[PDB]
Amino acid sequence: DAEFRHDSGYEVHHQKLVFFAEDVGSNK
Known about the structure:
Protein name: Amyloid-beta protein 40
Subcellular location: Cell surface
Subunit structure: Interacts with S100A9.
Largest sheet: none
Number of strands: 0
Strand content: under 5%
Radius of gyration: 12 Å
Organism: Homo sapiens
PDB class: proteinase inhibitor(trypsin)
Helix content: over 70%
């Protein structure tokens, strides 16, 4: 199940980094 929870938290990871990059990046 490696690649399983990998890609899963892989795109979701991008989700969190995109959120913070939106607030923090917007005013960074």
